[PDB]
Structure to design on (605 residues):
RNA sequence: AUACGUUAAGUGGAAAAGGAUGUGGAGUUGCUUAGACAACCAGGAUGUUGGCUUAGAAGCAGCCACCAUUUAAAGAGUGCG
């Protein structure tokens, strides 16, 4: 179970310095659809963005216990968490929204995440 | 195919097997080895049938071990000859076998391949046998 | 086929006793077998 | 979508292209001028080209670099590598020379970084048995 | 991790009698059924929820307990949604058409084929290819589906006669 | 007859090598409510069939150095092709 702690402690370090994030459903997650997003990360930055689909209520929600206490509602069903390190927010909220509109994975109608104390409506 | 270069006597008594093996019960020259559960005669041809079965499946690997060299002849009177009128002749050779004895040994071989080579030998040998490994207390 | 020592031939094969007689069944018809 | 290795300098006869893309509804006469256009910069080489197939019989093509590790034979200076790599280290290449090779493969490579583009080529140089120095 | 412990909701309207010993006369708009039950099983009716419980962990009881729930779920659905099984005829001259309640089948045998459905079952023929056997009883609809299949065993070399939709008959290469 | 069990084939009331999710006990061990075996919905690697080859055969003539990256994940390959 020691390996599971590495899954937990490391991601929390990002969330403590995290700026913005967005809901992404895992359904019909084609590998080609992922690469189109991964290339966008290469423009915005490098490895700093995180895809980690460790979205168990027993997993990521425990990380949310410290900060971002709005994940409890988003927790049921498939999720694909994203985290920012530096990068002033702008396109990150917009780029994923453009992808789902052109087929490729349900957006979940954007359940939303931390920005202030709100949920829905990407800007 | 293994036969003695010489023997002191052309023929010998068949004997009476009983009890635990006098020795060689514990494998150590090889990482793994077949161990008989009972005791029965084994003709020289049966031994050759086992080693040939292993050399093909093993491919490249360590040398096959043979702890048992046959020494006791089995008498074979010619067919339709009437009883008595002298003892017959040794058609071949048979090693003495005792329960718990290590019939064969193998070493330097991977764990998966080792399970099979011991198994194919078990079919050629009429005696029931079981998988065995080296002990190191030790 | 019917042999006293029925054995699996491939991973798809499955051992299932039926009516007191063990039978191995597989997606490939050739691998179908019954003991006794 | 049917990939093909159409030569850069020529595009017209049926046996290389022809029916194989002609059954796709592609208008062969209208695209052959295009193959000779952008590929003219690298004439004399066999350039692979992806071919997406739109329902409206519109088409857009993407040219690619000549195949990998062929360049490694040139940097090594030897026409052919060992049939027994590592066991027979016939050739050696400096790490800086590899940098010149990886940059050429960038449009073809999906590698995220130039440092990662190095590591991709390193797995190809070992196939030739060439030492990385 | 287990079968019969799971609850079974009744969407409705499906009443369930608890007459001994033990007969379960499920009732509703589509039909009625009375599955046999040996006394060792214990059926109970929570509000709009059928329930089943095991008397003991013994291996014989472990087998019977998982069957009783699966049957009752098959029963309620047939009293509601019902059931049907498609049959894809394949060939050239093959065709089928009803003649009264009887289902004539123009199978490639020179002899005409006819099959009579049992009461509570009907067989519409929307198309010459497809065949649909509607019925409230899964044990019976699957039996009739087998009896229709009996008329023509499928040929591995070529798609012919009865074939489940969908199912891949093994390919064979002739010469 | 009493008490603890076992057996389901008529074994009991006929043998063997060998074969088997038969069943009753005992022991060891992997994983496991920071998540198990079943699933049902997700995706399958990137350069690449990659070296040496056989007309060409790209997960696969077969012999292998069988590499490193994209990473929630995948062998330059488990398999039916």
């Amino acid at each position: 179970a020691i390996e599971t702690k590495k899954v937990v402690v490391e991601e929390i370090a990002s969330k403590l310095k995290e700026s913005k994030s967005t809901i992404i459903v895992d359904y019909r997650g084609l590998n080609v659809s992922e690469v189109t997003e991964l290339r966008k990360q290469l423009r915005e930055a490098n490895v700093e963005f995180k895809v980690y689909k460790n979205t168990m209520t027993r997993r990521a929600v425990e990380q949310a216990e410290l900060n971002g206490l709005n994940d409890f509602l988003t927790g049921p069903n498939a999720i694909a968490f994203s985290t920012e390190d530096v990068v002033a927010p702008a396109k990150v909220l917009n780029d994923f929204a453009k992808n789902h509109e052109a087929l490729e994975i349900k957006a979940g109608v954007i359940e939303g995440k931390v920005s202030t104390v709100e949920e829905v409506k990407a800007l | 195919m293994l036969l003695p270069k010489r023997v002191k006597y052309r023929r010998e008594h068949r004997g009476k097997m009983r009890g635990r093996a006098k020795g060689g019960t514990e494998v150590h020259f090889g990482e793994f080895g077949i161990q008989a559960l009972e005791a029965s005669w084994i003709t020289n041809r049966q031994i050759e049938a086992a080693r040939i079965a292993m050399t093909r499946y093993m491919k490249r690997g360590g040398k096959v071990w043979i702890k048992i060299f046959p020494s006791k002849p089995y008498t074979a009177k010619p067919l339709e000859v009437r009883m008595g009128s002298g003892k017959g002749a040794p058609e071949g050779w048979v090693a003495v076998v005792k329960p718990g004895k290590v019939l064969f040994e193998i070493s330097g071989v991977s764990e998966e391949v080792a399970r099979e080579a011991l198994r194919l030998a078990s079919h050629k040998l009429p005696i029931k046998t079981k998988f065995v490994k080296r002990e190191e207390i030790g | 086929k019917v042999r006293p020592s029925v054995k699996p031939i491939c991973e798809k094969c499955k051992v299932i006793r039926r009516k007191g007689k063990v039978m191995v069944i597989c997606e490939n018809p050739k691998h179908k077998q019954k003991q006794g | 979508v049917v990939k093909l290795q159409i030569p850069a300098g020529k595009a017209n006869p049926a046996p290389p292209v022809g029916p194989a893309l002609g059954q796709a509804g592609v208008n062969i006469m209208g695209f052959c001028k295009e193959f000779n256009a952008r590929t003219a910069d690298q004439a004399g080489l066999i350039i692979p080209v992806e071919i997406s197939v739109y329902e409206d019989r519109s088409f857009t093509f993407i040219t690619k670099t000549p195949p990998a590790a062929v360049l490694l034979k040139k940097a090594a200076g030897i026409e052919s590598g060992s049939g027994e790599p590592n066991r027979n280290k016939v050739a050696t290449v400096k790490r800086d020379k590899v940098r010149e090779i990886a940059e050429t493969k960038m449009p073809d490579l999906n590698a995220a970084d130039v440092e990662a583009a190095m590591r991709m080529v390193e797995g190809t140089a070992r196939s030739m048995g060439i030492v990385i120095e | 991790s287990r079968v019969g412990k799971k609850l079974l909701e009744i969407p409705s309207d499906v009443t369930v009698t608890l007459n001994d010993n033990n007969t379960v006369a499920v009732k509703g708009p589509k039909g009625e059924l009375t599955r046999t039950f040996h006394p060792d099983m214990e059926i109970k009716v929570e509000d709009n929820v059928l329930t089943v419980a095991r008397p003991s962990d013994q291996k014989e009881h472990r087998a019977l307990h998982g069957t009783t729930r699966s049957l009752l779920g098959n029963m309620v659905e047939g009293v509601s949604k019902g059931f049907e099984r498609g049959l894809e005829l394949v060939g050239v001259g093959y065709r089928a058409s009803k003649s009264g309640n009887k289902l004539v089948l123009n199978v490639g045998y020179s002899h005409p084929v006819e099959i009579v459905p049992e009461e509570g079952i009907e067989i519409e023929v929307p198309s010459q290819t497809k065949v649909v056997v509607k019925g409230t009883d899964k044990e019976r609809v699957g039996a009739i589906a087998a009896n229709i299949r009996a008329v023509r065993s499928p040929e591995p070399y070529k798609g012919k006669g009865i074939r489940y939709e969908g199912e891949v008959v093994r390919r064979k290469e002739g010469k």
